[PDB]
Design an enzyme around this catalytic site. Structure first.
Site, mmCIF file in Angstrom:
data_model
loop_
_atom_site.group_PDB
_atom_site.id
_atom_site.type_symbol
_atom_site.label_atom_id
_atom_site.label_comp_id
_atom_site.label_asym_id
_atom_site.label_seq_id
_atom_site.Cartn_x
_atom_site.Cartn_y
_atom_site.Cartn_z
ATOM 1 N N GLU A 148 34.283 64.443 38.810
ATOM 2 C CA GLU A 148 34.756 63.169 38.241
ATOM 3 C C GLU A 148 33.728 62.037 38.345
ATOM 4 O O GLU A 148 33.241 61.744 39.429
ATOM 5 C CB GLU A 148 36.097 62.734 38.847
ATOM 6 N N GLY A 282 35.396 59.820 48.488
ATOM 7 C CA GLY A 282 36.392 59.829 49.536
ATOM 8 C C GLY A 282 37.126 61.147 49.519
ATOM 9 O O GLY A 282 37.251 61.821 50.546
ATOM 10 N N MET A 284 38.777 64.110 46.134
ATOM 11 C CA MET A 284 38.914 64.414 44.715
ATOM 12 C C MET A 284 40.144 65.280 44.443
ATOM 13 O O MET A 284 40.338 66.302 45.093
ATOM 14 C CB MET A 284 37.647 65.085 44.192
ATOM 15 N N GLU A 285 40.943 64.884 43.456
ATOM 16 C CA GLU A 285 42.286 65.424 43.266
ATOM 17 C C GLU A 285 42.356 66.747 42.501
ATOM 18 O O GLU A 285 43.393 67.057 41.901
ATOM 19 C CB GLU A 285 43.161 64.395 42.554
ATOM 20 N N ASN A 286 41.274 67.523 42.514
ATOM 21 C CA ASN A 286 41.236 68.751 41.727
ATOM 22 C C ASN A 286 42.557 69.502 41.877
ATOM 23 O O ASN A 286 42.984 69.814 42.986
ATOM 24 C CB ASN A 286 40.073 69.654 42.134
ATOM 25 N N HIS A 318 47.523 59.593 48.395
ATOM 26 C CA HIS A 318 46.825 59.213 47.165
ATOM 27 C C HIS A 318 46.556 60.451 46.331
ATOM 28 O O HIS A 318 46.908 60.507 45.152
ATOM 29 C CB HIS A 318 45.499 58.496 47.504
ATOM 30 N N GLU A 319 45.937 61.444 46.966
ATOM 31 C CA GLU A 319 45.538 62.673 46.307
ATOM 32 C C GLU A 319 46.746 63.420 45.766
ATOM 33 O O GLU A 319 46.688 64.013 44.697
ATOM 34 C CB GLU A 319 44.732 63.567 47.259
ATOM 35 N N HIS A 322 48.165 62.105 42.440
ATOM 36 C CA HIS A 322 47.393 62.552 41.291
ATOM 37 C C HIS A 322 47.879 63.872 40.699
ATOM 38 O O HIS A 322 47.677 64.132 39.511
ATOM 39 C CB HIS A 322 45.915 62.653 41.635
ATOM 40 N N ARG A 808 27.434 55.844 41.739
ATOM 41 C CA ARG A 808 28.243 54.632 41.912
ATOM 42 C C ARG A 808 27.897 53.919 43.221
ATOM 43 O O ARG A 808 27.653 52.721 43.218
ATOM 44 C CB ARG A 808 29.724 55.033 41.883
HETATM 45 N N1 LIG Z 1 31.524 61.197 41.629
HETATM 46 C C1 LIG Z 1 32.405 60.429 42.266
HETATM 47 N N2 LIG Z 1 31.944 59.532 43.135
HETATM 48 N N3 LIG Z 1 33.726 60.575 42.038
HETATM 49 C C2 LIG Z 1 34.795 59.791 42.681
HETATM 50 C C3 LIG Z 1 36.187 60.415 42.626
HETATM 51 C C4 LIG Z 1 37.049 59.808 43.736
HETATM 52 C C5 LIG Z 1 38.569 59.954 43.574
HETATM 53 N N4 LIG Z 1 38.986 59.737 42.161
HETATM 54 C C6 LIG Z 1 39.298 59.007 44.546
HETATM 55 O O1 LIG Z 1 39.160 57.781 44.445
HETATM 56 O O2 LIG Z 1 40.033 59.433 45.456
HETATM 57 ZN ZN LIG Z 2 42.240 58.471 42.783
#
Ligand SMILES: NC(=[NH2+])NCCC[C@H](N)C(=O)O
Ligand SMILES: [Zn+2]
Ligand SMILES: *[C@@H]1O[C@H](CO)[C@@H](O[C@@H]2O[C@H](CO)[C@@H](O[C@@H]3O[C@H](CO)[C@@H](O)[C@H](O)[C@H]3NC(C)=O)[C@H](O)[C@H]2NC(C)=O)[C@H](O)[C@H]1NC(C)=O
Ligand SMILES: *[C@@H]1O[C@H](CO)[C@@H](O[C@@H]2O[C@H](CO)[C@@H](O[C@@H]3O[C@H](CO)[C@@H](O)[C@H](O)[C@H]3NC(C)=O)[C@H](O)[C@H]2NC(C)=O)[C@H](O)[C@H]1NC(C)=O
Ligand SMILES: *[C@@H]1O[C@H](CO)[C@@H](O[C@@H]2O[C@H](CO)[C@@H](O)[C@H](O)[C@H]2NC(C)=O)[C@H](O)[C@H]1NC(C)=O
Ligand SMILES: *[C@@H]1O[C@H](CO)[C@@H](O[C@@H]2O[C@H](CO)[C@@H](O)[C@H](O)[C@H]2NC(C)=O)[C@H](O)[C@H]1NC(C)=O
Ligand SMILES: *[C@@H]1O[C@H](CO)[C@@H](O[C@@H]2O[C@H](CO)[C@@H](O)[C@H](O)[C@H]2NC(C)=O)[C@H](O)[C@H]1NC(C)=O
Ligand SMILES: *[C@@H]1O[C@H](CO)[C@@H](O[C@@H]2O[C@H](CO)[C@@H](O)[C@H](O)[C@H]2NC(C)=O)[C@H](O)[C@H]1NC(C)=O
Ligand SMILES: *[C@@H]1O[C@H](CO)[C@@H](O)[C@H](O)[C@H]1NC(C)=O
Ligand SMILES: *[C@@H]1O[C@H](CO)[C@@H](O)[C@H](O)[C@H]1NC(C)=O
Length: 875
Positions: A148, A282, A284-286, A318-319, A322, A808
């Site tokens: 992501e 942090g 990732m919601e795979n 949080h995860e 998702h 980022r």
């Molecule tokens: N390549 C990256 N830094 N991806 C970030 C994904 C983090 C995820 N969506 C979260 O905030 O829990």
């Molecule tokens: Zn998120």
């Protein structure tokens, strides 16, 4: 070489967006890592629905190369002849041209595109990669993916857009000593050699590329079973097995809560969690295989802090959100990212509140998201929730406070306005309708509009299609007007241009003598509205539930300060935090005299609640920060605030006693005491630090970070620095490691901080995931503020080469310059930015930190005398 790069622009592949007429249906994906070699190969076959005559087929690919010539199949089954393939770098495409051109897929038949590819497992934390850890003295390997937003295209060639949902059947050929994981359960395992195993997973549900995940590991597991009867397991290093217990608990509790709350079954047969030893975000919601950074998953009740416990619980929650918002229903395009992130940031609090009853989580939303992002969204360089994005760098940039915190905040306002029951039902209907498809923001309003018949679209558009937020100006206790709130008074309130012209439809709530009323403040009421008992005091925006500030008449503010000094309990803890937060932001914005704001702090010797102390500390931290080098003002601000926290710091003491929130309070209150130079609090820190150096005494968990920090700052030297560095290496617990890194960054020694900065280039010592964290810690050091800033400049090319401009965290590192407040420092920033004008994902952070530093310079000019007067006349 086999698809060489070409600068041929004369095709549809020149467009940043993929074409509308090509949709995938199914991915046949096979990867074979050579773990010890840091390479992998793979083949992918994709079933394709074509809708328009084309002589070219293109999809996303970055860095990973095509190994031979791609081969294409007609829906009839025949082999389509291919003239060429080429790479088009500018838009991250690989393109194949037929010696042909073919017609749409009109029935149930589809084209099939097969490609062979080879990539790298080293030098990166995105795509498909390998990292190591030590177990019983042996170096072990684990490989995993992180995609992501636009990194699936690094792992394998794909149609790498969130709305190009396809189904997945994944297989991996790996050494037999390893297990393999993915989104779906294992279907079959077959021996290739007596050394290799091919692991094939069952068919996936239609899903976005950024969600596709696989891993090769030798991890143990802690297991749980949902009410659904489905296995929920957390994979973890054998050494660390005991620290997976808590996450396992929360996963079950929150999984069971959400499934019932959303009135929808989790779509997959199993759900796995795993923390990669080196991991770029942090978590990732795979779908079915949620990956984590260790600090966000692994918790030891004997060594971890309550802060850590809450962090774990919250990220897990949080995860889990998702798995519904993001996975089942995904945004159509990244401009609607908040449909994922804002929703997860909102529901995370409901999840953990269910799991942990006395955490006061609902109130903590103010501290975590609402108030912090009201700072962010008062800058000219903020952006609307729905954001135009045209490059991969722009896409990744919007994973920010606006998407998460403001997203979370305007849903919190929405829920309250629309009532929880109806918000709930509306979310359910949204999930039913767009399941396994994509939604726009328009789609979500209409869903809740079906559950309320209230004007959701009309009202919520104002909060969503323009940046910023209003301040409510109170005239005569009862009349309110709205005006855009900007921290910079010189800024043009109409910029950047907005169709809605920076007026909002504000759901307004207020409390008259313990009774609550509600009004929608309509945009078209240009000259304001009147709030409907003959009152002497109106409490507007209870619990800061609406995403706006309230500026009472000065007389009212004066009376609030007096009421606080007489009996602060008259207001709720949230209301206190909110009045304090607004007053100080209003003073910062030159909308309220600082004397009026500071007057609200007078009662604090009797303040005992978490929320108001947090927002006081936040406001003071800024003001203290602006006067750091001011020998005149600083000692006075220090002496005063030292006196204000002393009673509560003394009352709670240096020991882990009390409930969750109390322990959190003790931490921040003792920390503030130390920061303000309380000799006794500093002496406690030094004393405990000295004991911890003796190697036996295990520090009280909620005091550790403070002890490492202030202990090192006040009595650290080379011997204890070296010791702390060894301890950091020796502990397996990532949450402890992180505290020790903050400790190490706290030494008042240029030579030692220099050694520390050099360690950033040593991947045996500092993990790639932790480099920016360390730089930031060093920047907090009175010497290191400038050292960290100087180091990132000297080593900018090195960082860019290591992380890429698409990273980022690298884009954001320039925010270490936030405390800057002179023309000289601003010139330094501008000179550096002018020298490296290719900002990438750092484009927005640069704009924001420049605006902040310019505001700081102005702030000092406007308020030094006023603030000096207040303190001098008081002390
Ligand atoms: N390549 C990256 N830094 N991806 C970030 C994904 C983090 C995820 N969506 C979260 O905030 O829990
Ligand atoms: Zn998120
Ligand atoms: C860790 O911090 C503690 C404060 O939170 C310190 O404890 C305090 O030490 C002070 C100095 O010895 C005491 O001062 C006395 O306070 C009482 C008020 O109740 C007055 O009568 C006295 O005038 C005053 N000094 C005298 C008699 O000379 C504090 O009372 C005392 N206790 C508390 C709860 O605040 C710890 O000393 C400190 N620990 C370390 C290791 O430094
Ligand atoms: C809201 O803030 C006001 C402005 O700071 C407060 O009013 C001020 O209170 C001060 C005491 O806290 C006074 O300080 C005194 O000033 C005089 C003349 O300048 C000096 O001679 C005195 O020595 C000094 N006091 C001390 C201890 O040094 C201010 O004069 C006074 N100013 C005005 C205009 O009233 C309000 O009290 C405050 N409102 C609250 C708390 O509700
Ligand atoms: C992973 O390692 C490989 C092999 O060392 C790296 O490829 C090398 O790249 C440098 C220049 O970038 C060349 O001088 C070497 O000759 C290359 N070797 C090979 C075999 O291609 C590769 O860059 C690394 N991958 C990443 C993502 O950093
Ligand atoms: C995970 O939850 C279980 C219960 O579901 C916790 O185990 C209980 O802990 C309490 C308090 O220590 C004891 O009174 C019980 O004897 C335990 N077993 C029960 C109630 O079945 C466990 O502590 C939780 N995990 C973590 C990480 O704390
Ligand atoms: C910062 O740390 C350095 C490194 O320990 C200190 O330098 C040492 O100083 C002592 C004399 O006080 C010498 O015996 C050591 O040989 C020095 N080491 C090195 C590497 O030069 C230094 O004194 C500390 N500086 C401050 C301001 O605390
Ligand atoms: C603390 O750590 C350093 C690094 O391990 C010790 O060793 C010296 O490190 C410098 C670089 O900072 C090297 O140039 C020297 O070769 C090292 N000196 C040696 C090995 O004798 C340092 O001696 C340690 N100090 C204490 C007091 O433990
Ligand atoms: C939904 O959950 C219920 C209750 O757990 C279960 O019986 C059913 O099989 C599920 N239905 C679907 C369509 O997934
Ligand atoms: C508030 O607005 C009302 C209605 O427009 C008006 O009667 C009144 O004069 C205004 N001002 C004050 C100070 O109440």
């Amino acid at each position: 070489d086999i698809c060489p790069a070409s600068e041929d622009e004369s095709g549809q592949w020149k467009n940043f967006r993929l074409p509308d007429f090509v949709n995938p249906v199914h991915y046949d994906l096979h990867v074979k890592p050579l773990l010890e070699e840091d390479t992998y190969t793979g083949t992918v076959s994709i079933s394709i629905n074509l809708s328009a005559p084309t002589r070219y087929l293109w999809l996303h690919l970055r860095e990973t190369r095509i190994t031979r010539l791609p081969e294409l199949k007609r829906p009839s089954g025949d082999q389509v002849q291919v003239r060429r393939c080429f790479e088009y770098k500018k838009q991250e495409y690989v393109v194949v041209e037929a010696e042909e051109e073919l017609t749409p897929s009109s029935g149930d038949g589809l084209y099939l595109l097969t490609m062979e590819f080879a990539g790298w497992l080293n030098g990166s934390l995105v795509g498909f990669y390998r990292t190591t850890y030590t177990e019983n003295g042996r170096v072990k390997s684990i490989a995993a993916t992180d995609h992501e937003p636009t990194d699936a295209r690094k792992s394998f060639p794909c149609f790498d857009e969130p709305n190009k949902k396809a189904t997945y059947t994944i297989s991996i050929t790996h050494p037999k000593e390893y297990g393999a994981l993915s989104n779906m359960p294992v279907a079959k395992e077959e021996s290739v050699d007596d050394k290799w195993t091919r692991t094939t997973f069952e068919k996936s549900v239609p899903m976005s590329t950024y969600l596709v995940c696989f891993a090769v590991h030798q991890f143990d597991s802690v297991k749980r079973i949902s009410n659904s009867g489905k296995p929920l397991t957390i994979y973890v290093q054998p050494e660390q097995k005991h620290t997976a217990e808590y996450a396992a608990n929360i996963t079950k509790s929150v999984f069971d809560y959400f499934e019932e709350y959303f009135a929808m079954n989790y779509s997959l047969p199993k759900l796995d969690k795993i923390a990669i030893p080196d991991f770029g975000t942090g978590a990732m919601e795979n779908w079915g295989l949620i990956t984590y950074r260790e600090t966000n998953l692994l918790y030891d009740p004997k060594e971890s802090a309550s802060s850590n416990q809450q962090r774990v619980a919250t990220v897990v929650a949080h995860e889990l959100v998702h798995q519904w918002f993001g996975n089942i229903v995904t945004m159509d395009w990244w401009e609607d990212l908040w449909l994922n992130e804002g929703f997860a940031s909102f529901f995370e609090f409901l999840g953990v509140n269910h799991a942990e009853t006395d955490w006061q989580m609902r109130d903590q939303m103010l501290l975590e998201d609402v108030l912090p992002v009201q700072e962010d969204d008062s800058l000219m360089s903020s952006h609307p929730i729905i954001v135009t994005v045209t490059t991969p760098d722009e896409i990744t940039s919007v994973f920010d406070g606006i998407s998460y915190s403001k997203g979370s905040s305007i849903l919190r306002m929405l829920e309250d306005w629309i009532k929880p029951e109806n918000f709930q039902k509306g979310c359910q209907m949204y999930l039913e309708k767009y399941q396994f498809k994509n939604a726009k923001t328009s789609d979500f309003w209409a869903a809740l509009e079906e559950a309320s018949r209230l004007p959701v679209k009309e009202v919520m558009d104002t909060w969503t299609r323009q940046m910023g937020y209003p301040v409510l100006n109170v005239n005569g206790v009862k009349n309110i007007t709205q005006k855009r709130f900007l921290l910079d008074p010189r800024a043009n309130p109409s910029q950047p241009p907005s169709d809605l012209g920076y007026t909002w439809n504000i759901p307004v709530k207020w409390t008259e003598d313990n009774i609550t009323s509600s009004v929608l403040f309509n945009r078209s009421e240009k000259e304001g509205i009147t709030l409907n008992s003959g009152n002497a005091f109106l409490k507007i925006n209870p619990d800061h539930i609406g995403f706006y500030r309230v500026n009472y008449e000065v007389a009212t503010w004066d009376s609030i300060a007096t009421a606080l000094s007489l009996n602060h309990k008259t207001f709720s803890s949230a209301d206190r935090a909110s009045l304090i937060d607004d007053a100080f932001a209003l003073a910062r914005a030159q909308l309220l005299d600082y004397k009026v704001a500071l007057n609200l702090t007078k009662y604090l010797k009797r303040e005992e609640n978490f929320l108001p102390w947090q927002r006081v500390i936040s406001a003071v931290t800024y003001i203290i920060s602006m006067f750091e080098d001011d020998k005149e003002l600083y000692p006075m601000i220090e002496e005063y605030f030292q006196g204000q926290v002393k009673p509560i710091a003394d009352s709670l003491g240096w020991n882990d006693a009390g409930d969750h929130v109390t322990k959190l309070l003790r931490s921040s209150v003792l920390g503030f005491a130390c920061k303000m130079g309380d000799r006794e609090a500093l002496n406690n820190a030094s004393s405990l630090f000295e004991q911890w150096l003796n190697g036996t005494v295990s520090l009280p968990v909620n005091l550790r970070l403070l002890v490492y920090r202030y202990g090192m700052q006040n009595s650290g030297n080379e011997i204890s620095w070296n010791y702390t560095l060894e301890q950091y290496q020796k502990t397996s617990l990532a949450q402890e490691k992180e505290k020790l890194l903050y400790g190490l960054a706290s030494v008042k020694n240029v030579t030692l901080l220099s050694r520390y900065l050099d360690l950033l280039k040593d991947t045996n010592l500092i993990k790639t995931q932790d480099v920016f964290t360390v730089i930031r810690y060093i920047s907090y050091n009175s010497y290191g503020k400038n050292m960290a800033w100087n180091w990132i400049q000297l080593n900018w090319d090195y960082l860019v080469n290591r992380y890429t401009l698409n990273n980022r965290n690298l884009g954001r590192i320039v925010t270490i310059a936030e405390p800057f407040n002179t023309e000289l420092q601003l010139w330094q920033m501008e000179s550096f930015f002018a020298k490296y004008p290719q900002a990438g994902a750092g484009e927005k952070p640069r704009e924001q930190v420049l605006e902040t530093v310019k505001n700081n310079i102005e702030w000092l000019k406007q308020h030094r005398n006023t603030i000096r007067e207040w303190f001098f006349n008081l002390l």
